[PDB]
Amino acid sequence: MNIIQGNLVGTGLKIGIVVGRFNDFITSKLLSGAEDALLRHGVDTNDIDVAWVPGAFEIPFAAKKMAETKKYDAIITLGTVIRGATTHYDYVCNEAAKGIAQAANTTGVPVIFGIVTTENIEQAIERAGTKAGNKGVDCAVSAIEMANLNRSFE
Template identity: 40%
Template sequence: MQGADKGQSNRLDGRDLRIGIVQARFNDELTSEMARVCIDHLVSLGVQRKHIQHVTVPGALEVPVALQAMADSEKFDALVALGCIIRGETYHFELVANESGAGVTRVSLDHHIPVANAILTVENEAQARARVIDKSKDAAIVAVEMANLLDELL
């Protein structure tokens, strides 16, 4: 296959999409900003606010089960996972990062639904703050683009 994917720009039209967002409340100041940016960017891509369902859960480990419930409902074209895991002094960081990431991927593969994983895994709060806006916008773009791609493929 040569050249860039010519259909990519057409895939950024969110007008007919329904998107579910699961936000971890742990590090709430950061994750609430992520949700705001992601929702605003989804709207800028054409997704109607009334077609965006935003729920919160306690932390990153709870994100996959809420994503799974949304996927089970078959009401959504794509899902978004938002969270922020900041390294601490114990192994807990690795456990939460690895297990939440694996759970998000499992939901996507088991349910054949795109899940944009924007659960930040960072060393400190400064790194998190530096990534909040870009990763949140990226999650919106990935959700819309992948929902449209899967619609083309299936």
């Protein structure tokens, strides 16, 4: 059986991140986590670009555009969608995942999915550097892995 795997050394990678302004109480902490984890895995802070957008509906648009430049080894997406009174949540979540998925697919560039989607605020706090760790961290890790594996893919 032949195993193909990306390892975790970030040295020399170039990474784009798209971050939503909506719920930026949470999303800035996700960006912090991601920043940190990348640098401590060896990415140069000079090699990270960060595009801010209004909210998660816009993430796929900025993601595909950044991917299609060919400047980046992997793209990180970061957002938080917390349930409200109505179903609007869902349409957003749904479109967001679907487009992120499409952006990797059309582009051949790894696009990591970091949209924390929850029922309430304490839940979002759990995944932004508390009890359940930090999704921005795990995302940064998966991005390095995917950038390394995709080199086996040309």
